[PDB]
Design a protein around this ligand. Structure first.
Ligand SMILES: COC1=C(OC)C(=O)C(C/C=C(\C)CC/C=C(\C)CC/C=C(\C)CC/C=C(\C)CC/C=C(\C)CC/C=C(/C)CC/C=C(\C)CC/C=C(\C)CCC=C(C)C)=C(C)C1=O
Ligand SMILES: CCCCCCCCCCCCCCCCCC(=O)OC[C@H](COP(=O)([O-])OCC[N+](C)(C)C)OC(=O)CCCCCCCCCCCCCCCCC
Ligand SMILES: CCCCCCCCCCCCCCCCCC(=O)OC[C@H](COP(=O)([O-])OCC[N+](C)(C)C)OC(=O)CCCCCCCCCCCCCCCCC
Ligand SMILES: CCCCCCCCCCCCCCCCCC(=O)OC[C@H](COP(=O)(O)OCCN)OC(=O)CCCCCCCCCCCCCCCCC
Ligand SMILES: CCCCCCCCCCCCCCCCCC(=O)OC[C@H](COP(=O)(O)OCCN)OC(=O)CCCCCCCCCCCCCCCCC
Ligand SMILES: CCCCCCCCCCCCCCCCCC(=O)OC[C@H](COP(=O)(O)OCCN)OC(=O)CCCCCCCCCCCCCCCCC
Ligand SMILES: CCCCCCCCCCCCCCCCCC(=O)OC[C@H](COP(=O)(O)OCCN)OC(=O)CCCCCCCCCCCCCCCCC
Ligand SMILES: CCCCCCCCCCCCCCCCCC(=O)OC[C@H](COP(=O)(O)OCCN)OC(=O)CCCCCCCCCCCCCCCCC
Lengths: 73, 116, 117, 173, 315, 100, 66, 341, 96
């Protein structure tokens, strides 16, 4: 009667999957972005400084609307 | 090390219209942007390597930023909706802003820019 | 780093609280001269545990120190394969692993890897 | 900032280390310090690659000497020194106080961290340890590594000959 | 913004900490049920409903039970060793790869090597601090384990590292997108499990505990509080090392659900083996590591140095 | 750098051990100086390389600049502790992060 | 014989060395193949590399398709 | 190189270690060669048949480890301030390097370990220590240019090296104090040139190479053994001991030529006062050499009579007799030598 | 001074290492314990100097290789100590 094992395995499977599925939830709710920036390479860090400076929030994106639309020439 | 006799350009000259455009927005237009400003970029980047004086490449640098700002005015004029979706996807799809995830939305933009 | 240190401290505090709860939550009874005596299968012990404990893998123990310090020189391999000259990288790496194997097989054949007997 | 506090701890643990007598008391003091020095070195470098290596190397030496301590100096004694605890705790707080009221832009080490480097430095955008460890395996410095190899292997012949395994185990007779 | 970022990193570690701490409680139940079914037994079935609350029903006892103050032990060392055993077990989890960033950890593979080695001191100090003959034999039986598995462990990690190109664990995902390294590395997978057992000191390599050779090994002189943390720290090691097998040989799709179906299965394998094999002989392990595994592992560095070189020419 | 007397082929082994010639701000500064040592020899070079040695040392050792920096900081603190500065205007405006 | 004794006593060192010997062989193919393609000159360069049309290196630009 | 194939290796690796040091164009490279040299000598030095030998293997190890440790300490410090392997104007940081090197070679102020480790060495071990191990240390001191520190070591070396030797009877311990004196002459010769030092060292090693064999071939370790030593022709025994006079630098013999060239150059460099203290102190060194010759110059002794026969190794003796011949008649070959001009 | 603000601490630590290497402790192992303490501090300074160079830290591996061998050799001599004297106490050795 091998069913009785499964209740043990379901709990461990769920509990260990809570963190990654929680931060994916928390980040969206609290950053607005599912994933956080990856400071793995100098270029990634460098640009991260750039975003943090311009918008004052690295996870708020500055689309084309930040560009001055017209120049009087 | 900087002394009085060392000549730095005046503040007004260094002032010039800047991009101030976030990372994900930049990475979106990278491939189409690059094909256009390559002439300025290579001219700028070539001197900077051979000659390592920032004030010497001051003139070329203004060309590079102008070309970048010139490109986005076109994008702002036509594909504004598409570019924002591509950038939004590229930003909100992974922590690295990899192109490998957003191939679909990318296609939408590439067809907009090649039709306009 | 500085993030990791903070969480390293925070965890250590948390785990520390756990016994500090256990030390209080634990039932408390008067300690006896026999309750705290060591366990050695119910018969009083002849010999302190702090007597010199003889060693037989001493030779391997020293060889362990060495072999690790060559792990410091193989680990960088991957990181510098895209950036190095292939002949120099290839040649040197091989004559690194052959040297290790030859050393190992030499001692294995000499019987040093066997314990003191 | 923690760099100064790292300075205080490494000093503090060194003062007590001068006063340890029991070999294991020395070992515990040394092990704690190997953590800090490993941490401190990576602050002033482009990567922590060497702290990992140093930490790993010494831990190998930490175990082995316990094995010999537990065979040679097994029966020895500790003595809590109220002079020592007060003295270290006295200076430790004293040093920690300074680090809060220190011009800690001046105390920072001038060695260029990875972020301390310019943005133009094209060589700083590669893998974290590519260039630094590079010429360890390129002409001509590679031969130095090769020289170590014999040196390490020749060492491996020295220990067995000094040791003379066959004439018995080791006991503190 | 940036100020907010590190707040999330705290939450993740705390979330990962409580989740791991909870799982090791339920792992111990799973160990008893599965090990109770490989043996034709039923396993814990009465307490609460169908036995599920069993591990909690034991955590009560191990904490309402008195501390033991051994007469001949250096009490402070004897009292602290459980803390660092549990701390080192939880701390090594911060390097477990997440695509939703938790910690960057370039050179994460090394960070594994450092942390796992530390786990020996806690056993080592606990045994010597207890100041009992069996406890000391347990401690020195544990140290001799490190002398064996430690060197071969690094080399086998290096082989996997050559395949991915870096010490960052994230890259295992990209290279295991079409297939699983289990196929390419079948003998190493089989060898790696063997060394993984030594890491966690399990049957057939159960020497630190040494049950039925030493009465209870280095735990022989611990009780309610200290012994519990030693126990939890033990099963946290199994859980992580099982996961580290899933990121290396079984896809490393941390965000997919199946990855956690896989993770429990490898945990089952660790229990499965405990119910199959008798314990090795204290010396046969050390001979095994140096006579066979070390020679084996070095042989494939050449195989993978050549293969990477050959593959480099084509690409 | 030292001059071995022997100068057998072994010196080739350890000659290139530590250098500045691999992607360094002082690569050109040292090559000139050390070249001048080769032209004039060691002992006479120490008397003809006044500029090259000082420049190279002020490029690597950097004592000359770090020891400017403290004079500025100390003189900023000395002014304040004398009351010549104020708390509100103690420091100047910080540089932009995306610079240097 | 010898082959038999080892193959009976320590089969792993024979099989392991069999694959180790494989490494040297196909390392010798790949390394020779590498200079049979002039792979020192790599079509994709780390960093932003710009040459002048008259520089000697500008002649050696590897011309590929994708 | 006496017992097994392994001893052959350690000798060679010693040569490689020394060469790496003296061919290194930087302090760090030089320091590495010292480490190579360190472990090449210890296994040659350690033998478990002797309780004394392992003690010798210790004192050397602790001393050399400390020396290389402090040596590396200063070298890092030296180029932390100058950023060069060389210091433009010598100062304290360069003195510290000198102190380590002298201890590495057992000069006067830090010689204590050197005789006190000679009790438990075989003669062939002492030769490797006395001659070869002093190459690498002394050869690096030629780079450093501190005068007073180097000058002080010379003055103490000749004094301590001589006065200490009067009280010994163990030939191994006696030769150590004798070697400390000859070390003093080197350092004096090292502040003036090296070619003299290279010449002087070669002759010093030559004489020590000879005296070691005579004790090594006939296994003599104490003064009494010299008188009890049996030789067929007392003329032969009389002549073998005439090498000590050369080691004393008496002009009729070859062993003075080295001392002679060190004076013709020190005097040329106006170091008159140094030579007075040195040459005067060499007399005391010449003294206890004569105490050995008491067993040869008088040439009829009361000797134990359960030996009629000499049992000696051929090849060592064959090479020893050749070396001895020049050690007595080597002076007229100064014409040939062209390394002094 | 520059040397006092940046290089003082490691040097002060180094000399404290030496004063351990000379103090009177019964067991020879007390020398080995303090031996790799000093090596740990030598690494620290050497790592300061190597980082004044942009990319020269690879020499740290060279230093570590010699660090273990002197410790490994230092440990072997202790083993040979035991099997002639029976114990490693300093006071057990002939004072000469
Ligand atoms: C007869 O022949 C035989 C032998 O020969 C003698 C054998 O040896 C054996 C040997 C058998 C084995 C070795 C089996 C393996 C078992 C062992 C090694 C040890 C036995 C113990 C177990 C299996 C239990 C496992 C669990 C533990 C030991 C404790 C671990 C710690 C745990 C679970 C705590 C986790 C922490 C948490 C925060 C979880 C969530 C919350 C709690 C626990 C809180 C609990 C309650 C509260 C806080 C109260 C709050 C109340 C209010 C607010 C009102 C057999 C089978 C045999 O047949
Ligand atoms: C040589 C190699 C040694 C490698 C092992 C190093 C650690 C061994 C320390 C053993 C305990 C030392 C001691 O007794 O000090 C007691 C000290 C007190 O010193 P004490 O002098 O007061 O003790 C004697 C008390 N009287 C006077 C009453 C007799 O207590 C402690 O705080 C020690 C805490 C040890 C914590 C456990 C360490 C585990 C580390 C795991 C790896 C790192 C994570
Ligand atoms: C199990 C043992 C089986 C019997 C001994 C080995 C028989 C197979 C011969 C392989 C070649 C010799 C290996 C050997 O004995 O070590 C070198 C032995 C001595 O071993 P060793 O213990 O003195 O260490 C040797 C150190 N090196 C390598 C640096 C020289 O003999 C020699 O060194 C030279 C003769 C080689 C040929 C001897 C046959
Ligand atoms: C093809 C290679 C042929 C190698 C032949 C080796 C045959 C027997 C190997 C063996 O193990 O026999 C016993 C022999 C005795 O050596 P011993 O000192 O007792 O040490 C323990 C050995 N298990 O063990 C040995 O002496 C050597 C054992 C290791 C030999 C590995 C050689 C691999 C070469 C590739
Ligand atoms: C929170 C409170 C949860 C428990 C509420 C229980 C309410 C049900 C009625 C009372 C009761 O039955 O409690 C005991 C319960 C079942 O009875 P049990 O002792 O396990 O006997 C075997 C049954 N097959 O056994 C239980 O489930 C009690 C478990 C409570 C303690 C769980 C440990 C964690 C701490 C919770 C606080
Ligand atoms: C009181 C003193 C308080 C000071 C804290 C002392 C406890 C130290 C605990 C932190 C150890 C971990 C650490 O700091 O690692 C730092 C470094 C990380 O470097 P990196 O690869 O870039 O990864 C960064 C990811 N965010 O990686 C390393 O430098 C190697 C770290 C090895 C850690 C071993 C585990 C030690 C556990 C604590 C023992 C006490
Ligand atoms: C379903 C899920 C199942 C999960 C199972 C998990 C099992 C985990 C537990 C495994 C540990 C079992 C016990 C153990 O550790 O055995 C190790 C193994 C035993 O062998 P051993 O003891 O050495 O033999 C007697 C020596 N006197 O030691 C060994 O000898 C193994 C050595 C492995 C060597 C492999 C070499 C492979 C070579 C590949 C190429 C071969 C093809 C021919 C050559 C090709 C050349 C081109
Ligand atoms: C009784 C115990 C004490 C004995 C006497 C000890 C005092 C010895 C004299 C002090 C040491 C040497 C003095 C000296 O240097 O004399 C140099 C003198 C000046 O000549 P000049 O070469 O022109 O000087 C350099 C250029 N201005 O010109 C000269 O003097 C050079 C001629 C040789 C001088 C040798 C002096 C040493 C004599 C030692 C005698 C030892 C006692 C023997 C009994």
């Amino acid at each position: 009667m091998w069913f009785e094992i499964l209740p043990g395995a379901v709990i461990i499977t769920t509990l260990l999957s809570v963190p990654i599925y929680a931060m994916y939830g928390l980040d969206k709710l609290m950053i607005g972005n599912a994933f956080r920036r990856n400071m793995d390479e100098r270029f990634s860090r460098v640009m991260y400084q750039r975003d943090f400076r311009l918008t004052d929030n690295p996870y708020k994106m500055n689309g084309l609307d930040a560009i001055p639309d017209e120049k009087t020439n | 090390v900087i002394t009085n006799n060392t000549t730095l350009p005046e503040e007004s000259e260094l002032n010039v219209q800047e991009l101030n455009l976030s990372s994900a927005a930049l990475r979106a237009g990278a491939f189409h942007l690059g094909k256009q400003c390559e002439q300025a970029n290579n001219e700028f980047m070539l001197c900077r390597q051979e000659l390592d004086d920032p004030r010497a490449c001051l003139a070329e640098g203004k060309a590079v930023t102008s070309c970048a700002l010139d490109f986005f005015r076109k994008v702002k004029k036509t594909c504004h909706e598409e570019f924002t979706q591509y950038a939004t996807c590229l930003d909100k799809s992974s922590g690295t802003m990899a192109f490998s995830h957003c191939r679909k939305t990318q296609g939408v933009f590439d067809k907009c820019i090649k039709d306009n | 780093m500085f993030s990791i240190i903070f969480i390293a401290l925070l965890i250590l505090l948390i785990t520390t609280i756990v016994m500090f709860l256990a030390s209080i939550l634990s039932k408390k009874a008067l300690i006896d001269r026999e309750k705290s005596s060591p366990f050695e299968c119910g018969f009083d012990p002849k010999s302190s545990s702090r007597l010199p404990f003889s060693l037989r893998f001493f030779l391997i123990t020293i060889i362990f120190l060495i072999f690790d310090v060559e792990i410091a020189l193989i680990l960088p391999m991957i990181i510098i394969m895209k950036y190095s000259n292939i002949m120099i990288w290839t040649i040197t790496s091989i004559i690194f692993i052959l040297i290790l194997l030859i050393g190992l097989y030499h001692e294995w054949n000499q019987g040093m890897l066997n314990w003191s007997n | 900032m923690i760099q100064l506090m790292l300075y205080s701890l490494i000093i503090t643990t060194s003062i007590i280390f001068l006063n340890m007598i029991h070999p294991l008391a020395l070992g515990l003091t040394l092990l704690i310090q190997t953590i800090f020095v490993c941490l401190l070195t990576g602050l002033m470098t482009k990567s922590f690659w060497y702290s990992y290596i140093l930490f790993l190397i010494f831990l190998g030496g930490m175990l082995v000497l316990f094995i010999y301590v537990t065979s040679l100096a097994s029966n020895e004694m500790f003595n809590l020194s109220m002079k020592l605890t007060l003295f270290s705790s006295l200076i430790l707080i004293f040093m920690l106080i300074l680090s809060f009221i220190m011009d800690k832009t001046s105390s920072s080490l001038f060695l260029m961290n990875n972020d301390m480097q310019s943005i133009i430095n094209m060589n700083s955008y590669f893998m974290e340890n590519s260039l630094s460890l590079n010429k360890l395996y390129n002409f001509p410095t590679n031969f130095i590594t090769i020289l170590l190899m014999n040196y390490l292997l020749i060492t491996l012949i020295v220990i067995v000959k000094i040791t003379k395994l066959f004439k018995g185990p080791i006991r503190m007779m | 913004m940036f100020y907010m970022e590190f707040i999330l990193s705290l939450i993740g570690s705390l979330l990962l900490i409580i989740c791991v701490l909870v799982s090791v409680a339920f792992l111990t139940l799973l160990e008893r049920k599965v090990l109770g079914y490989i043996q034709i037994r039923k396993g814990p079935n009465k307490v609460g409903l169908m036995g599920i609350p069993q591990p909690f029903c034991d955590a009560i006892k191990l904490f309402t039970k008195e501390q033991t103050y051994p007469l001949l032990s250096n009490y402070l060392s004897y009292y602290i060793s459980p803390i660092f055993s549990l701390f080192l077990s939880l701390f090594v989890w911060m390097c477990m790869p997440f695509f939703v960033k938790l910690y960057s950890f370039n050179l994460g593979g090394l960070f594994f090597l450092c942390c796992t080695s530390l786990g020996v001191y806690t056993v080592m100090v606990a045994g010597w601090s207890s100041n009992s003959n069996y406890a000391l034999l347990g401690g020195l039986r544990a140290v001799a384990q490190t002398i064996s598995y430690e060197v071969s462990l690094a080399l086998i990690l290096l082989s996997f590292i050559f395949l991915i190109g870096s010490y960052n664990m994230i890259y295992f995902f990209f290279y295991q997108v079409y297939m699983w390294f289990l196929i390419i590395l079948f003998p190493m997978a089989l060898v790696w499990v063997s060394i993984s057992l030594a890491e966690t000191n399990r049957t057939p390599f159960d020497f630190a505990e040494g049950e039925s050779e030493l009465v209870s090994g280095f735990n022989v002189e611990y009780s309610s509080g200290g012994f519990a943390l030693i126990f939890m720290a033990e099963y946290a090691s199994i859980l992580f090392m099982s996961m580290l097998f899933c990121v290396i040989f079984l896809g490393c799709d941390v965000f997919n659900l199946l990855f956690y179906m896989k993770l429990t299965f490898i945990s089952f394998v660790f229990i499965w083996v405990r119910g199959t094999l008798p314990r090795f002989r204290y010396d046969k392990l050390m001979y095994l590591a140096w006579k066979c595994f070390l020679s084996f592992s070095l042989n494939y560095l050449l195989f993978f140095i050549g293969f990477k070189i050959l593959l480099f020419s084509l690409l | 750098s030292l001059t071995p007397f022997l100068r057998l082929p072994l010196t080739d082994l350890t000659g290139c051990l530590i250098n500045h010639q691999t992607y360094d701000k002082c690569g050109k500064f040292e090559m000139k100086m050390m070249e001048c040592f080769e032209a004039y020899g060691l002992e006479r070079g120490k008397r003809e390389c006044a500029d090259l040695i000082s420049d190279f040392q002020e490029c690597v050792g950097m004592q000359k600049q770090l020891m400017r920096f403290h004079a500025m900081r100390n003189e900023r603190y000395k002014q304040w502790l004398k009351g010549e500065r104020k708390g509100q205007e103690f420091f100047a405006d910080p540089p932009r992060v995306d610079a240097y | 014989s010898l082959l038999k004794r080892a193959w009976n006593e320590i089969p792993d060192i024979v099989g392991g060395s069999a694959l180790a010997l494989a490494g040297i062989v196909m390392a010798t193919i790949g390394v020779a193949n590498y200079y049979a393609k002039d792979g020192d000159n790599r079509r994709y360069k780390l960093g932003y590399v710009v040459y002048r049309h008259d520089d000697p290196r500008a002649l050696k630009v590897r011309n590929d398709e994708d | 190189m006496f017992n097994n194939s392994s001893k052959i290796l350690f000798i060679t690796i010693m040569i490689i270690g020394t060469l790496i040091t003296v061919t290194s164009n930087s302090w760090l490279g030089a320091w590495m060669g010292l480490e190579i040299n360190l472990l090449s000598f210890i296994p040659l030095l350690s033998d478990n048949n002797n309780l004394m030998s392992t003690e010798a293997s210790l004192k050397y190890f602790l001393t050399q480890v400390l020396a290389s440790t402090v040596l590396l300490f200063s070298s890092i410090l030296l180029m932390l301030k100058n950023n060069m392997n060389n210091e433009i104007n010598e100062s304290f940081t360069s003195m510290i390097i000198m102190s380590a090197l002298l201890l590495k070679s057992g000069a006067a102020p830090f010689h204590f370990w050197f005789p006190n480790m000679m009790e438990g060495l075989t003669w062939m071990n002492a030769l490797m220590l006395m001659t070869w191990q002093k190459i690498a240390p002394l050869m690096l001191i030629s780079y450093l240019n501190i005068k007073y520190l180097l000058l002080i070591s010379v003055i103490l070396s000749v004094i301590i090296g001589a006065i200490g030797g009067l009280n010994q009877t163990s030939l191994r311990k006696l030769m150590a104090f004798s070697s400390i004196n000859h070390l003093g002459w080197m350092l004096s010769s090292l502040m003036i040139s090296e070619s003299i030092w290279l010449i002087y060292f070669f002759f010093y090693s030559f004489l020590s190479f000879v005296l070691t064999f005579m004790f090594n071939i006939f296994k003599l370790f104490h003064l009494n053994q010299l008188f009890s030593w049996f030789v067929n022709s007392k003329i032969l025994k009389f002549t073998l001991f005439m090498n000590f006079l050369s080691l004393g630098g008496l002009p009729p013999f070859l062993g003075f030529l080295p001392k002679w060239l060190v004076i013709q150059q020190l005097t040329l460099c106006n170091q008159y006062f140094m030579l007075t203290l040195m040459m005067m102190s060499t007399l005391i060194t010449l003294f206890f050499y004569l105490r050995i010759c008491y067993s040869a110059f008088m040439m009829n002794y009361f000797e134990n009579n359960w030996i009629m026969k000499m049992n000696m190794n051929s090849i060592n003796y064959n090479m020893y007799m050749i070396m001895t011949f020049f050690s007595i008649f080597g002076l007229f070959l100064i014409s040939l030598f062209y390394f002094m001009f | 001074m520059i040397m006092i603000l940046y290089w003082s601490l490691p040097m002060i630590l180094f000399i404290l290492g030496l004063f351990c290497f000379v103090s009177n402790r019964k067991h020879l192992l007390s020398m080995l314990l303090s031996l790799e303490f000093i090596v740990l501090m030598l690494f620290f300074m050497l790592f300061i100097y190597l980082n004044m160079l942009n990319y020269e830290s690879y020499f740290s591996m060279m230093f570590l290789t010699f660090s273990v061998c002197e410790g490994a050799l230092g440990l072997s001599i202790l083993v040979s100590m035991i099997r002639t004297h029976g114990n490693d106490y300093f006071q057990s050795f002939s004072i000469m």
